[PDB]
Symmetry: D2
Subunit: 106 residues, 4 copies
């Protein structure tokens, strides 16, 4: 697993999608992101090691991945339909979710 | 890790919600189901062990957990809102997802 | 935009989906169901005409459609992917939602 | 009915959340946005009047509302729970959607 590695996968596969040529490239990218995001679910981050897993921050931290997992789920559907541009637009809109979690837990 | 133990978690906890006397017991059990479902997302079941990880069956398999994870998410909100009975309903409505996936790959 | 006709639309198109021969027949059916569900969202059922629209019953009632709308939304993706059978399965799975709402508000 | 009636409500209720006091003020405003979005789903904007209802921009348009509705839905929960801080957040993340869909039809 490892949290840092999962974030490597996310950041890298997002870039690919920004400069992807076709739907197939977008599928493969989003699919790998989905796996990293699901894997990162139960990772206790550095800045929350002193709290209980029952804490609001840990529930809020896990809540962030629910949002990310859902967006990728739906974004992959667009890719499967051959809609490269609206898949790329949805890939871009993950950033709002990425930034929100970082801004207060990273 | 073990997919068998992930289903054990999902089953056991679904019974816990079935008879819970307060929100805390529901919240906690739902949280355990979420971690299990997110764990099980990456797995490869027995009937598709030899088959490729990129097969239509495996795409639907992963998709089934995307639905379950998404339902567990909304249920937990309902529990967090103190709406215990509605969370218990929502937990019952998961069975459509459990059964649909079982009807085939189990 | 009557609630009875909206429900007539849901039930009739659910039958259409069961015996559909192509993706477009499923797409069209789901789109009609999507409209009926979006339309019925602001409705008040006979059992709660008396009650205020800000009551818990109406929140839970309206919330029922959020789920149905969400489920239809997803099943339409499956239809657009050419996954007709899985779209039919997802349609079959809607009845957990249909029955949950009827078992109390019908 | 009426597009402009629906859309003006969305930015107005945003400004309540922009600087609200409590879960009360936020929970109310969001529910009005939930009714505006569901009513807007069926509507046809002026720019793509000539294009078929089966247009791929009508689908971009409709799909854009499924995401807004879905995001409203989640912010509403956080407000019910008493997470007034996080409901604003989540309400902040709605902007990525608004301006995206606006980057064409507005
Ligand atoms: C929480 C809910 C998060 C979401 C959603 C995303 N990220 Fe994240 N990220 C998060 C944490 C707590 C950390 C710190 C890891 C650590 O051990 O310090 C990160 C880190 C990254 C990094 C690396 C930064 C570093 O200091 O090493 C990257 C490159 C990164 N995150 C990218 C990223 C992307 C692209 C996301 C969505 C598309 C995303 N993250 C979501 C917490 C969370
Ligand atoms: C696929 C998308 C699945 C979903 C969603 C759920 N389950 Fe499952 N389950 C699945 C498989 C492939 C199997 C077989 C595992 C094996 O190796 O035999 C199972 C098995 C179970 C079991 C039996 C436990 C065992 O001895 O292996 C239970 C009790 C079970 N599943 C429960 C369950 C519940 C409660 C679910 C949702 C609420 C659920 N499953 C979803 C595949 C999938
Ligand atoms: C509430 C959240 C509901 C959901 C979700 C669904 N239905 Fe429904 N339905 C609902 C009500 C309150 C009523 C009664 C309408 C009235 O004024 O009497 C209905 C009614 C129907 C009917 C008509 C049956 C009758 O007794 O007259 C049908 C055929 C029907 N509903 C079908 C249906 C289907 C197929 C749904 C999902 C796929 C569904 N409903 C969801 C409230 C709600
Ligand atoms: C499409 C998928 C849209 C989304 C999502 C949002 N908006 Fe929108 N908006 C859209 C259109 C096509 C129009 C033009 C309607 C018309 O005929 O005038 C609008 C208009 C507005 C307006 C009115 C502007 C004015 O006439 O002065 C407002 C205030 C507005 N939109 C706000 C708004 C907000 C706050 C949104 C999300 C939070 C949002 N819109 C999403 C298309 C779409
Ligand atoms: Zn979608
Ligand atoms: Zn777009
Ligand atoms: Zn909900
Ligand atoms: Zn209920
Ligand atoms: Zn889906
Ligand atoms: Zn199926
Ligand atoms: Zn949420």
């Amino acid at each position: 697993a490892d949290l840092e590695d999962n974030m490597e996968t996310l950041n890298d596969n997002l870039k690919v999608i920004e400069k992807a040529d076709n739907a197939a490239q977008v599928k493969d990218a989003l699919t790998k992101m989905a796996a990293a995001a699901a894997d990162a679910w139960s990772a206790t981050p550095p800045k929350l090691e002193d709290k209980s897993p029952d804490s609001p921050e840990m529930h809020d931290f896990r809540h962030g991945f629910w949002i990310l997992i859902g967006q990728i789920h739906d974004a992959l559907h667009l890719a499967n339909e051959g809609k490269v541009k609206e898949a790329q637009h949805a890939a871009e809109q993950l950033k709002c979710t990425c930034n929100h979690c970082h801004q207060k837990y990273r």
